RNA sequence: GUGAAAUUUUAGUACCUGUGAAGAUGCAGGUUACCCGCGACAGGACGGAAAGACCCCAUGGAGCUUUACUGUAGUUUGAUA
RNA sequence: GGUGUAGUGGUAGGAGAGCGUUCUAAGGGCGUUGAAGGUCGAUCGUGAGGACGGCUGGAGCGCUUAGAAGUGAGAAUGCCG
RNA sequence: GUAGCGGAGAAAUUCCAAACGAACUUGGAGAUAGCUGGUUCUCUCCGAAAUAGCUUUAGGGCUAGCCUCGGAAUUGAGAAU
RNA sequence: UAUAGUUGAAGGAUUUGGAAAAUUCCGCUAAAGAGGGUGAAAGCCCCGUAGACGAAAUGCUGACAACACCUAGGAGGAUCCUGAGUACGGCGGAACACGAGAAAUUCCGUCGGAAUCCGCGGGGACCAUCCCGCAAGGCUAAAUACUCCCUAGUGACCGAUAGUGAACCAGUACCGUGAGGGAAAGGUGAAAAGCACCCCGGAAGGGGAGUGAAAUAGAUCCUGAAACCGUGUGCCUACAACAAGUCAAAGCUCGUUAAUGAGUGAUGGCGUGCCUUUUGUAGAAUGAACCGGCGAGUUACGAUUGCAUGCGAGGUUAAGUCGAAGAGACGGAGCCGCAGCGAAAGCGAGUCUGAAUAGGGCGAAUGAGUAUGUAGUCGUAGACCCGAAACCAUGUGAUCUAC
């Protein structure tokens, strides 16, 4: 059969123009009277992956 | 080349021998034949289809 | 080329590898398995994207957005490709098509300015950009959103 | 006269003191010993028979208990036909 | 092709290049003046392996080039004899 | 006559066709087993690990570290004094 | 048209054999050189094949005839009709890819319960406006699924431990109260010509003589491997502690794919099997009595990388139609690439964040793809093979034992 995509991966990342991944941040929902203004900054930009977690991950993304 | 069916049914039966019509010319007819005896309104009908 | 002297092109065709086949070949005795382990069983691994029993990444990160149901997607054509016609034609989507440089025009045609014209066209589309209108109207044109 | 069995890597299959996966017929150094059998005894072959029943594990089972969790047959109480 | 210099222990494992079995196609062959199979020999190659000769045997089988695979056995307290 | 989510028990977890903490037969079924056993031809080149971090994790796994094959790249980035 | 049938071309000698279809000469035939048989391998010997011909009877399928049924316009808009315990709503369940969810639509149980063309339902809670339809009555060919069976065939499918469990009198013998489980076992020769007669012996069996190309092809019958059991001989062996060989070597006995020959060997040096699992094994850790046969990374569909070929800012067709189960043309729906950024509105070689033209993120700046073949890895499928204790759902047992 065809294979099938991971839909919780699909639905928090998303595929950039030159083949890499960007994602969101952790840390980004709760607490924040424990973190510091600069933490909080700092944790609203955007990343990407690391080649790490890319191995491991390609499969599951193929198609979107 | 077409309805001419005499000619088929008299070159069938030898054992050297294949006949095929000119809308019907495979690559595996042609590359085990040793020659190919075509005759001239044959020829103009696989020009015609090779374009 | 005759039947009894065939020969594939260089490169073309590889044998195969066949384990379990005795030591000296290289995979006899377990087969490139290693010793004992899940991995060593038939049918043995773990699942895509698994790690044991940390917290997978994808489930540390936050979901993100939504998909809008009335999205418009165009079919960019930027302005090289109005350059492979005569000065003065009146470039429309169906002399766009039947050059196949646009099939599937998603929700319409829209000109992007990258990067120079020189032709004296007439274009007909459903959107330019402030620079395509622009440009196509110096080298001496005329645009038409229809 | 008739006629099995469990067992079995191949065997021309000694003793002492050592060595060694730390208790050797088979390895070292010695000591003893012509070749082939019969009737008897059980010290060794970590002798045979039974992939330890003791102990721990498998995010194994199964039977049992209850003020462990989540359900339910049965019993009861109200509304409505 | 010569000549120099350097190298060539190996478990898990990666990479290269080959030997042999059965069947398909095309080509060129052998066979009751004896095919396959079996048995013996003091033969050849760096290895898997290849020939030639004797005896047995009685009807089928090699070689070249390409293709396809139920394609190689010493072990599972394996299964049948 | 009483039948397996069952029966029968002067009560022993006792009996229900030489086996009963839940009979026998067929099917789901090639159940599942992070465990144990086995896995069949040849030569040439290279050649590990037995560690860190996280883990209902500790004889399993994942990412890094350590091996092998193919490419790219300015160098004079590597090593030993 | 299905179910019996008819007719159907063309060869002799020679060599080797028991026997030719083989060999060598010289001929003929083909709308027939597909296949099977015959004492070995046949276009021309036999059965057939290509082509031509045929049905008393019964059953099927067409066509055209009869017979049976069914089917008309224009206008009016006074009034009447158009499927009721129904649509629908509350409560509880289920079906829709949709797990109560913001839950439209379709069903079932229970209770409540419309309107009538100035009407009624739907467009995913709900309302208004616009648009598309007219429930609560019935039937209907084809294009799609399957093969116990009959005819005709096909295979880079098996060839007697294979292929059906079963090539043979097989669901048999055998096992169980029963439901149920379930095998082993093919081959003389061209032709039985299958050994008349004699001799030893109760017979079995054997030796002659005969058959036959061959009997060491004699019915336990083609070939006839290994384990295992014997008989005969060249060389060694009764003072010797041996994982059984390997290296050195006198004597004896032979004489080969002819070369730095072959068998045996007193005596001397050296030397703790094979496999698995282990930090580590001769292991007193694990497996194997021996010999033979069988017995384990495969395929389908997807995803990715390397190699190879054709086109190249482009590449390529799917289902389907004609065609020999084929090649070999039509078919451009669709798919990938050619532009990105942003949650989105959107903007575009740039865009997002931001008051910012600042800075920063991701992109551009000549920067190659696509179809197919082949090999390496991965996913879904039993997915390299073998191995539980158990769990569930139909059925069969009180001929033993308990009451």
């Known amino acids: 059969?065809?294979?099938?995509?991971?839909?919780?991966?699909?639905?928090?990342?998303?595929?950039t123009g030159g083949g890499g991944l960007k994602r969101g941040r952790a840390f980004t929902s709760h607490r924040?009277?424990?973190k510091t203004k600069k933490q909080?900054?700092?944790?609203?930009?955007?990343?990407?992956?690391?080649?790490?977690?890319?191995?491991?991950?390609?499969?599951?993304?193929?198609?979107? | 080349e077409n309805?001419?069916?005499?000619?088929?049914?008299?070159?069938?039966?030898?054992?050297?021998?294949?006949?095929?019509?000119?809308?019907?010319?495979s690559v595996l007819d042609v590359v085990s034949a040793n020659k190919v005896l075509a005759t001239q309104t044959a020829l103009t009908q696989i020009e015609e289809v090779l374009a | 080329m005759k039947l009894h002297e065939?020969?594939?092109?260089?490169?073309?065709?590889?044998?195969?590898n066949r384990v379990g086949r005795g030591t000296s070949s290289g995979n006899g005795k377990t087969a490139g398995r290693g010793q004992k382990?899940?991995?060593?069983?038939?049918?043995?691994?773990?699942?895509?994207?698994?790690?044991?029993?940390?917290?997978?990444?994808?489930?540390?990160?936050?979901?993100?957005?939504?998909?809008?149901?009335?999205?418009?997607?165009?079919?960019?054509?930027?302005?090289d490709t109005l350059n492979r016609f005569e000065d003065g034609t009146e470039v429309?989507?169906?002399?766009?098509?039947?050059?196949?440089?646009?099939?599937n025009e998603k929700a319409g045609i829209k000109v992007l300015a990258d990067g120079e014209?020189?032709?004296?066209?007439?274009?007909?589309?459903?959107?330019?950009?402030?620079?395509a209108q622009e440009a196509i109207e110096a080298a001496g044109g005329s645009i038409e959103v229809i």
């Open chain 3, 6 to 16: 065939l020969k594939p092109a260089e490169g073309s065709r590889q044998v195969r």
């Open chain 3, 92 to 103: 429309t989507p169906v002399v766009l098509k039947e050059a196949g440089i646009v099939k």
């Open chain 1, 1 to 15: 059969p065809k294979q099938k995509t991971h839909r919780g991966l699909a639905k928090r990342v998303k595929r």
């Open chain 2, 3 to 25: 309805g001419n069916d005499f000619a088929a049914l008299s070159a069938r039966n030898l054992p050297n021998v294949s006949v095929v019509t000119s809308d019907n010319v």
């Open chain 1, 40 to 64: 909080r900054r700092q944790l609203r930009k955007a990343s990407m992956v690391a080649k790490g977690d890319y191995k491991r991950i390609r499969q599951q993304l193929a198609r979107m």
């Open chain 1, 32 to 34: 924040f009277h424990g």
């Open chain 3, 37 to 79: 382990g899940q991995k060593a069983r038939s049918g043995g691994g773990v699942r895509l994207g698994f790690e044991g029993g940390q917290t997978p990444l994808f489930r540390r990160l936050p979901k993100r957005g939504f998909t809008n149901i009335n999205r418009k997607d165009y079919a960019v054509v930027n302005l």
């Open chain 3, 117 to 131: 014209l020189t032709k004296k066209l007439t274009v007909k589309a459903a959107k330019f950009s402030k620079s």
